[PDB]
């Protein structure tokens, strides 16, 4: 059985994906979550967000618990132009949350407290945000 962290974060992803046409639900991966939590264990609580360079897709946040980070990522839909699909600096988290071809997610968390609060990383497989593939993987609202 999943931890409370895993079940709450998975539900928050799949509540949002179900808003979109032809977009399957994700399942949780212990492999992805071990990778994510290992990286969080090593965060320096400095306030900067640097990507891991790994083999999986990746969303990062600072200042939110797990489900609250998912909500912030998904709210980027407000900036996304469905008639000009593609990457942008303030829609790249949203397009990975709903990426049609992604099938599994796993996440980790570390409590920095102080000025920064919680660090959250979610890892995804297959990865989203491939150039030339947005129109086929980022579907409109049902």
Residue numbers in the entry: 158 to 299
What does the paper say about this structure?
Two crystal structures of the CAP domain of pathogen-related yeast protein from Saccharomyces cerevisiae, Pry1CAP, are presented. Our previous studies revealed that Saccharomyces cerevisiae CAP proteins are required for the export of sterols in vivo and they bind cholesterol in vitro. The sterol binding and export properties of these proteins are localized to the CAP domain, which is sufficient to rescue sterol export properties of cells lacking endogenous Pry proteins. The overall monomer surface area for Pry1CAP is 7125 Å2 and its topology is an alpha-beta-alpha sandwich made up of 6 helices, 2 disulfide bonds, 12 beta turns and 1 beta bulge.
